Amino acid sequence: QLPADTKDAKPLLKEMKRGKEFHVIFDCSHEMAAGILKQALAMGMMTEYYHYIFTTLDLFALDVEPYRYSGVNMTGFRILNTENTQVSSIIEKWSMERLQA
Amino acid sequence: QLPADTKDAKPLLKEMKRGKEFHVIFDCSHEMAAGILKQALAMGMMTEYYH
């Protein structure tokens, strides 16, 4: 279980690494995925060995860049149908009004 | 040999990782050491393996 605070992530990952858990499933609002991935990097774990999975259905949202050359696999799940033209159009339109926040 | 700019580092480190060169000596004014180490990190080239 992830402890209460996000930045307490350290021991848990540390135990996982010591125990040599070479697969992981997550389940949490991607907002938690950000914290857990930053730890998973700074703890020197993003190596093509480990191979995460996410059930949080918004994996696409995360900034995949600073991890992408490392070589881990982050199979996820997305439903918002980016494939269709009109869907993407409406995404963009809503985006042009989304950024007022 | 490191190329002209530092951020150019990526191909070289790619070769080091591919051939599995598990040790290194560097040499640079540390200002180069910083960028080369950052690349060393984001390349998945910074673990308890290497030294």
DSSP string over A20-65? T-------S-HHHHHHHHHHHHHTT--STT-EEE--STBGGGS--G
Distances (CA, A) of A38 to A78, A95, B42, B47: 21, 26, 12, 15
Task: Please tell me whether residue A78 adopts helix, strand or coil conformation.
Answer: strand
Phi, psi of A58 (to 5 degrees): -120, 35
Closest CA to A44 of A5, A7, A17, A6: A17
Whether A91 contacts chain B with CB within 8 A: no
C-alpha–C-alpha distance, residues A50 and A71, integer Å: 9
Tell which of A37, A38, A47 to mutate to test the B interface (max B CBs under 10 Å). A47
Resolution (A): 4.2
Counted residue by residue, chain B has a size of 51
Residues of chain A positioned with their CB less than 8 A from the CB of B43 = 69-70
Structure determination method = cryo-EM
- The span from the CA of B44 to the CA of B40, in Å, is 7
Whether residue B47 lies within 8 A of chain A, CB to CB, comes out as: yes
